[PDB]
């Protein structure tokens, strides 16, 4: 029993965090094999090719714990700087670079000066921002998921938007969202609620013994989407309904039956009650996160 | 900017998790130097749990009755001893991944990270607090016994909790790393229940100061209160009494934001009276009590 916002164990990622310094700027880097990956703004209307051509290998100071690594090459891939180092990281885990979709969750290992300070769980919002917790020096912190023994790196932190939310790239340097790595007027778009995740969290509440919100009613997918669109909820597709299949079979509540509970919750509120200790409908647990936490998959 | 429920990086603790097996029972152990620490109920059957005599069950065991597995390597048990409700298994290999560590006993209201494990394999990390009723609101399945709670301050891991049981309400009970249970619980399957839980007042105040630091002031008011009047109101909402120690502890946050502790207490009194009226504080529609004053200073 119990339901917590749970992150993946961060140890495999901790052994990859390094400190990257260029001039007056210090931020974090990810050391995998003989390459250190970091935001290209560490060299900073910027002309990154022009700023980079003026740099030499010895301009980049890379620190791994109390050991200085020597940079032997440098190249840019989109908004990520790749620093070739002489030493391969002996703690390099089995890994992949993956680009995630909005609604998907991941763990963030927040770092300062190449030293991990905390781990938290978050989701890629539909507006491509993340609601993170970052201070100055956090740039280069990474997001990941762990599947079996493989670490899938999906995010690298680059900036904070005026509303306090965060923007970053995948590990190939492509931003999530219409953001650019430049000091200019940028804003997060209007956000929406991740419907499939709220339904997954409602199934988690039923598994943990909370059934007050259930009702005898059902709905059609079209009628539910007309309701969900009124409340700034992401449309629910047939793929979402299929992905919720296992949870529906385990609890005995059809996905469209759970959609009828959600419809009533949106139209009437909770009426002083809570669901899994929350007075808001939680959307940062995917169907897989619910299954994993209510089954016990280890890494 | 931003405020999240944040756990400590678990890597230093991952390198200490092992699987301990005795007979039909398998749970987790913590391997530090040449000792593996685990709940003493690993020697019990489900029948033994009603009225176990641990000294009598332990005297019948030998070293080779305890199978300890660290990854794909079996460790050899060369000694065993009981200290309160923890079994200590002396092994022939010191853990090369042993971090700098301490065993600390925490007080209610204190927070810590839990590395939830199954079969000696870590599956997740979350942040939680020692409730005033000495239980924790965790997330544990069968096989999680032996999972540990910790804080990392600087390079030192301070172990403060080892999981032993789940109470009928779905909350959890455990011991410190010296085997002393938190609260009036025993490692027996007798009728046991969590006492009435209360809200950790000093933590809600700390979280209100975190909201002010992140730019949210809607809940502030022109009022102040005496400590006694605040406690008379707090008790009516099941809030823990606020002591002069708590007021002293909140001093730095009060100095940083410019809001006196008793002025912040007056906002809390008004929030308990009126609710949030459709508003949120740090993305929450409830008053959060699982961030200490120390956690707020660390993350903000
Ligand atoms: C979710 N299940 C779970 C989670 N966490 C721990 C457990 N194990 C226990 O509670 C065991 C079995 C039931 O009886 C007792 C009584 C006392 C003690 Cl110290 C341990 C136990 C489970 C079964
Ligand atoms: Cl304490």
Swiss-Prot record, chain A:
Annotated source species: Severe acute respiratory syndrome coronavirus 2
Effect on the protein upon substituting residue 199 to V: In strain: Zeta/P.2
Localization per Swiss-Prot or TrEMBL: Host cytoplasm; Host Golgi apparatus; Host nucleus
Record: active site: 41 (for 3cl-pro activity), 139 (nucleophile)
Cited function: Cleaves the C-terminus of replicase polyprotein at 11 sites. Recognizes substrates containing the core sequence [ILMVF]-Q-|-[SGACN]. Cleaves and inactivates human TRMT1, preventing tRNA guanine(26)-dimethylation of tRNAs. May cleave human NLRP1 in lung epithelial cells, thereby activating the NLRP1 inflammasome pathway. May cleave human GSDMD, triggering alternative GSDME-mediated epithelial cell death upon activation of the NLRP1 inflammasome, which may enhance the release interleukins 1B, 6, 16 and 18. Also able to bind an ADP-ribose-1''-phosphate (ADRP).
Protein name as annotated: 3C-like proteinase nsp5
Record location of the Glycyl lysine isopeptide (Lys-Gly) (interchain with G-Cter in ubiquitin) cross-link: 5, 84
Catalytic activity: TSAVLQ-|-SGFRK-NH2 and SGVTFQ-|-GKFKK the two peptides corresponding to the two self-cleavage sites of the SARS 3C-like proteinase are the two most reactive peptide substrates. The enzyme exhibits a strong preference for substrates containing Gln at P1 position and Leu at P2 position
Domain Peptidase C30: 1-299
Effect on the protein of changing residue 84 to R: In strain: Beta/B.1.351
Residues on Cytoplasmic side: 1-299
The gene coding this protein: rep
Resulting phenotype, residue 183 to A: Does not affect ability to cleave and inactivate human TRMT1
Subunit note: 3CL-PRO exists as monomer and homodimer. Only the homodimer shows catalytic activity. Interacts with host FBXO22; this interaction promotes the proteasomal degradation of nsp5.
Record comment: activity regulation: Inhibited by pyridone-containing alpha-ketoamides compounds 13a and 13b. In turn, alpha-ketoamide 13b (tert-butyl (1-((S)-1-(((S)-4-(benzylamino)-3,4-dioxo-1-((S)-2-oxopyrrolidin-3-yl)butan-2-yl)amino)-3-cyclopropyl-1-oxopropan-2-yl)-2-oxo-1,2-dihydropyridin-3-yl)carbamate) inhibits SARS-CoV-2 replication in human lung cells. Inhibited ex vivo by michael acceptor inhibitor N3. Inhibited ex vivo by compound 11a and 11b.
């Amino acid at each position: 029993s119990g339901f917590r916002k749970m992150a993946f164990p961060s140890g495999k990622v901790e052994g990859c965090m390094v400190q990257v310094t260029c001039g007056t700027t210090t931020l974090n880097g990810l050391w995998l094999d003989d390459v250190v990956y970091c935001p290209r703004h560490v060299i900073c209307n910027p002309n990154y090719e022009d700023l980079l051509i003026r740099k030499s290998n010895h301009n980049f100071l890379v620190q791994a714990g109390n050991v200085q690594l020597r940079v032997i090459g440098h190249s840019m891939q989109n908004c990520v700087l790749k620093l070739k180092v002489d030493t391969a990281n002996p703690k390099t885990p089995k890994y992949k670079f993956v680009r995630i979709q909005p609604g998907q969750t991941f763990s963030v290992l927040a770092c300062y000066n190449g030293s991990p300070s905390g781990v938290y769980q978050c989701a890629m919002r539909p507006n491509f921002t993340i609601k993170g917790s970052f201070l100055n020096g956090s740039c280069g912190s990474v997001g990941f998921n762990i599947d079996y023994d493989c670490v899938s790196f999906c995010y690298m932190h680059h900036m904070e938007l005026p509303t306090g939310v965060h923007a970053g790239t995948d590990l190939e340097g492509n931003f999530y969202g219409p953001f650019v790595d430049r000091q200019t007027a940028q804003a997060a778009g209007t956000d929406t609620t991740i419907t499939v995740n709220v339904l997954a969290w409602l199934y988690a509440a039923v598994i943990n013994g909370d059934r007050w919100f259930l009702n005898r009613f059902t709905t059609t997918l079209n009628d539910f989407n007309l309701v969900a669109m009124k409340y700034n909820y992401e449309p629910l597709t047939q793929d979402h309904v299929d992905i919720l299949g296992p949870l529906s079979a385990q609890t005995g509540i059809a996905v469209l039956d759970m959609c009828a509970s959600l419809k009533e919750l949106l139209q009437n509120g909770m009426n002083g009650r809570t669901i899994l200790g929350s007075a808001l409908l939680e959307d940062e647990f995917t169907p897989f996160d619910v299954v994993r936490q209510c089954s016990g998959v280890t890494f």
